[PDB]
A and B are shown apart, each in its own frame.
Chain A
Amino acid sequence: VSVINTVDTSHEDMIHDAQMDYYGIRLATCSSDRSVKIFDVKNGGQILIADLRGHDGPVWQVAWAHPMYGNILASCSYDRKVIIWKEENGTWEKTYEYTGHDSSVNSVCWAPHDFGLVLACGSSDGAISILTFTGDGPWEVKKISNAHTIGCNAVSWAPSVIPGSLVDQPSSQKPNYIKRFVSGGCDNLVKIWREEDGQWKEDQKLEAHSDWVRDVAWAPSIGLPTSTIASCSQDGRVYIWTSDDAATNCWTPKLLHKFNDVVWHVSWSITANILAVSGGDNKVTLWKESVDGQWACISDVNKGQG
């Protein structure tokens, strides 16, 4: 794919992470410069529309909420805060601030919109916080204390799956979704969490990494029964975890690849089950499963070929 017009974020430091909005009309970016910048890149035309300042340290991750709640952005930082930004009438404001962590908040992820407006937050204090907005009153907080022994680096929600979607549910009850998410931590564990009776419990421990789990990504449901998770680590390995039966809760690790350097995190493509993998070698590799179940690198993107 030939490159188009070159953008300019007018930054003063490394952008740690970047996320497009749901319609791909906006780009949020966050940096060591403590800013969250929003660009409205519609039909080319690079356009800074907001410089959101409110963090006291480096901002690690940004997450767009589903557009059914309006234009909402979450950010998390080394300053131990999670900030919720909302646009009203083209003005961006801080609508909520969560300060319930004792250390750096490394990752944020919005739940599937079927569950409501729910945010998962993973911290270097080893805890995970689930922020829930009900529409009326303050944000509710469910904190999982000691989720990881040393620190939580990454959180990713499971896809919204209706149990028994092949059986006519009587048309008068909201489907009872199995709310799950995965986390990766500095204890080398990938952990799966489930909501039961309004409490979050550890459902599974996944043991294959030999050093800190850097990122975890739950694959979107492509209408297959198989659930897939990617994880990457300081040990240079990427694992694909598969579970063919949601009832067995049996997760099998498959080694994707071992890099010579650290892997940051792997991001799933929405439509093609393609894994993007970002390494310490300054490369981004794209991976796809072949029909024989082997994983092949389909592209190697170097910094500088644009």
Chain B
Amino acid sequence: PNWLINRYKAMDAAELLRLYLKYDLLEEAAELVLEYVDALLGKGHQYFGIQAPLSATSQLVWFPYSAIDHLRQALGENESNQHNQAILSKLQRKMDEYFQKLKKATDDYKKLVQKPLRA
């Protein structure tokens, strides 16, 4: 019933992803992860208890790698399932966009932290 969900998703912005991939809710799990990545890119961060995107240097960013690897395994165990493969390919393309932007932001943070040991 949407009230509960909305309220356990900016107070505890993940562990539910786990309640989801346990109660066999693969579809909705991939959805939550995508939503969270979207938040992290500065888009809708207020609906994910996130303070910053490409701003105020780099602080903390928890990446739910184990839940994403379970999603990759579950999408690979369905094989024939065309719908799950279409979702998996969309998710992979989005993860690659994220890792490319993360690499750029990390390289720019490394340049920012190198200015100044000239005080």
Decide: A104 and B60 in contact? CB cutoff 8 A: yes
User: Is A57 among interface residues, defined by CB-CB distance under 8 A?
Assistant: yes
Q: Provided the pairs A13-B66, A149-B117, A150-B113 are in contact, do residues A78 and B15 lie with their beta carbons within 8 angstroms?
A: no
Within 8 A of A (CB), among B54-104: 59-60, 62, 66
Could you say which residues of chain A place their CB within 8 Å of the CB of B66? 13-14
CA distance A67 to B114 in the complex (A): 45
User: Is A103 among interface residues, defined by CB-CB distance under 8 A?
Assistant: yes
Within 8 A of A (CB), among B22-64: 59-60, 62
Could you say which residues of chain B place their CB within 8 Å of the CB of A78? 60, 62
B47 to chain A, nearest CB (A): 18
User: Is A160 among interface residues, defined by CB-CB distance under 8 A?
Assistant: no
Decide: A12 and B18 in contact? CB cutoff 8 A: yes
Within 8 A of B (CB), among A49-71: 57-58
CA distance A56 to B117 in the complex (A): 33
Among candidates B59, B62, B113, B117, residue contacting A32 with C-beta atoms closer than 8 Å:
B62
Decide if the interface of chain A is mainly helix, strand, loop or mixed: loop
Within 8 A of B (CB), among A12-31: 12-14
Interface residues on B, range: under 10
State the interface size on chain A (CB cutoff 8 A): 12
Could you say which residues of chain B place their CB within 8 Å of the CB of A149? 117
Q: Provided the pairs A33-B15, A150-B113 are in contact, do residues A58 and B62 lie with their beta carbons within 8 angstroms?
A: yes
B100 to chain A, nearest CB (A): 23
CA distance A150 to B113 in the complex (A): 8
CA distance A149 to B116 in the complex (A): 10
Decide: A12 and B15 in contact? CB cutoff 8 A: yes
CA distance A57 to B117 in the complex (A): 31
A55 to chain B, nearest CB (A): 12
Q: Which residue of A lies closest to B12 (CB)?
A: A34
A261 to chain B, nearest CB (A): 17
Q: Which residue of A lies closest to B49 (CB)?
A: A56
CA distance A224 to B17 in the complex (A): 53
CA distance A55 to B89 in the complex (A): 36
Within 8 A of B (CB), among A40-89: 57-58, 78
Decide: A103 and B62 in contact? CB cutoff 8 A: no
CA distance A104 to B113 in the complex (A): 17
Nearest first, the 9 closest Cβ-Cβ pairs linking A and B are A78-B60, A12-B18, A104-B60, A150-B113, A57-B60, A12-B15, A58-B62, A103-B59, A33-B15
List chain A positions with a Cβ less than 8 A from chain B: 12-14, 32-33, 57-58, 78, 103-104, 149-150
- Given A57-B60, A149-B117, 4 extra CB contacts under 8 A: A12-B18, A32-B62, A33-B15, A104-B60
